[PDB]
């Protein structure tokens, strides 16, 4: 029993982290086979970051201008290219610690583990949800760029995020491993703001199933609701519409607990309309939306 | 910016996890050099766990009765001994992935990362504080025993916990790596309960400094307090006495922010007496006590 925000074991990703230095800018890179992937703004000076022309800055760099270090070993750069907002550095040595991997573009509402790194060295790991506004609530200081987000499925690492920047309110933005940003952000130091966020309904429902499994059942009412009436009520509380695809994804938790999804929707409807009356659910005084149905199943059945 | 509950990168510990099977009981072991450490109740059947005589059960086991598997390799057990509540299995192969390590007994109020494992396979990582009642708020299912807690200092892993059992309310108990339990618990399946817990004052203060660094400063009042008056007020809210050793440990955060510890104590005193008036601090509606001053410094200065 117990329910905690849990990250994937980071070992497979730790073995891929390297330091990339270009001139006087240093950040992290991800070394998979003979390629190192890193944010393209490693080629900028502080001044260039205000309004960079990456294509122009890159044409004046050669392979030798990129210094890649993996522990106490310098890797020789033998090729370079830019793909969207990431640079790919071909190196003369394939990473022997390369796990089985894939690059995936995650959807809003999904979670992943972040391995925060500085100077190519892993410092910590934590779980994030890709918010509906395409930001994550991370924790990153100067030099964290190139830190990656991932999921692990059996032996396979699905890399989904690479860190690039921090937005107002202390939220974070980045790209997939093909360098395409999540959200309408650009890698330039200019005024940018995230759009208004929304609560991930299907995740709040998943976390209510986690609470039931853990013995916190006070919020369970005796009613049911229709999907339409639930979505009409939940819209005013800035909750995402719950789709039939979301109801299907909640099926395993619903079957495990014997609580129909629409019955849990009636319990959530009452919690939204009446509040929690000073009570907690899994120790929280607020409804949590950063656990997916898979995250819950992972911990509440194995 | 940002502040998240963050675990240490688990790679160094993942390379030490093995599966230990004795008869029909399976749990996790920690393989360091040529020794595998695991909870002694691996030698029990379900029936033995109700009231076990470990010394008696162990005398009827030989080395061959312990099957240790590290990935796809079976390790041969060539010696065994029991030290308090842990069994030590000498194996014929030294773990080549053994990091630099030490065994430490952590103090109440301190935090560590837990690598939850099943069948010798790491599943997830999360941060815990050793509560003043010597329990942790973990997340463990059947088969999790032998999962370990640790801290990482530069290249050195300090192992401090090995998981043994779950107590009422879904809290967890275990031993140090010398097999001595934290708290007045025993490894027997009989009615046991944790003592009344207390709030770790120095950690709440550390987390208020984290909030200030992150720009959440609404709770800062214009007053100071004496240590005696702070401790008189905080006793009724079930907060641990704040000692001069705790005030000294908060020194780096106090110097970084320019807020004296006793001034933060006056702000905490007002929060305890008046509540948070529906407001949040670092997104939380409750005061958090599971971040040590070191955990805060780690994230709010690097
Ligand atoms: C990469 N190492 C850093 C990570 C930042 C540093 C503070 N916390 C983080 O997550 N990335 C940057 O410094 C990027 C980088 C230029 C400026 N920048 C920012 O994150 C800035 N943000 C923005 O300009 C904004 F709001 F548009 F997102 C900063 C004000 C420094 C936080 C580039 C190329 C975008
Ligand atoms: C080790 N694999 C498990 C981990 C437990 C299983 C459920 N969640 C966990 O943390 N440890 C045990 O099953 C230990 C083991 C016998 C019984 N036990 C317990 O944790 C039980 N608890 C107690 O009897 C109590 F309350 F005293 F702590 C159980 C009721 C199964 C949760 C031994 C030898 C203590």
Author numbering:
A (entry chain A), B (entry chain A): 1 to 302
From the paper:
Severe acute respiratory syndrome coronavirus 2 (SARS-CoV-2) encodes a main protease (Mpro, nsp5, 3CLpro) that is essential for virus replication. Mpro cleaves coronavirus polyprotein 1a and 1ab at 11 junctions with a conserved Gln residue at the P1 site, a feature with no known human analogs. The essential function in coronavirus replication, together with the absence of closely related homologs in humans, identifies Mpro as an attractive antiviral drug target. The SARS-CoV-2 Mpro inhibitor, nirmatrelvir, was found and developed as the oral COVID-19 treatment Paxlovid (nirmatrelvir/ritonavir).
The crystal structures of the Mpro mutants with the greatest reductions in susceptibility to nirmatrelvir were determined in the presence or absence of nirmatrelvir, including S144A, A173V, A173V+T304I, T21I+S144A+T304I, T21I+T304I, and L50F+T304I. The triple mutant T21I+S144A+T304I conferred 27.8-fold resistance, whereas the A173V+T304I mutant that emerged in all three selection schemes with escalating nirmatrelvir concentrations led to 20.2-fold resistance. It was noted that the hydrogen bond interaction between adduct imine nitrogen and G143 backbone NH could be significantly weaker in the S144A mutant than in WT Mpro because the distance between the imine nitrogen and G143 NH hydrogen is 2.08 Å in the WT Mpro, while the distance in the S144A and T21I+S144A+T304I mutants was 2.80 Å (34). In WT enzyme, the S144 side-chain hydroxyl group forms hydrogen bond interaction with the L141 backbone carbonyl group and stabilizes the loop.
